[PDB]
């Protein structure tokens, strides 16, 4: 697989078993915080519908995405193994057209 600025994380949660309000916002913050160890994030989307527990991420550069994918892939998250896979830039932009011009690094909502 060819490296890009964009990736997908899977197995991060199961939407059917997520009851607490604003759970998806907490996942987003978990991912932002962890990606700040690499090179940060400019776009993130927590898929609240797919059973696979998918999170889409765009980093500010290809180098930042590679560092994040290598460090996130195969980790445990809440007792389950997570997968990280690259998404081609046109596939990602078709899903999320507003990410095309995102440039600002994201900050978690919580403290």
């Amino acid at each position: 697989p060819l490296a890009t600025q964009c990736f997908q994380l899977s197995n991060m949660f199961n939407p059917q078993t997520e009851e607490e309000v604003g759970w998806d916002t907490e996942i987003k913050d978990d991912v932002i915080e962890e990606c700040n160890k690499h090179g940060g994030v400019i776009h993130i989307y927590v898929d609240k519908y797919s059973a696979q527990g998918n999170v889409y991420v765009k980093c500010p550069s290809i180098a930042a995405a590679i560092a994040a994918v290598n460090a996130l892939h195969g980790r445990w998250f809440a007792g389950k193994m997570i997968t990280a896979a690259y998404v081609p830039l046109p596939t990602y932009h078709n899903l999320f057209p507003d990410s095309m011009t995102a440039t600002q690094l994201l900050v978690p909502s919580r403290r």
């Binding site: 978990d30 445990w76 389950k80």
Partner: peptide, 9 residues
């Protein structure tokens, strides 16, 4: 809150 690196029960 702790979810990163938490193995199964």
């Amino acid at each position: 809150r702790k979810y990163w690196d938490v193995p199964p029960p």
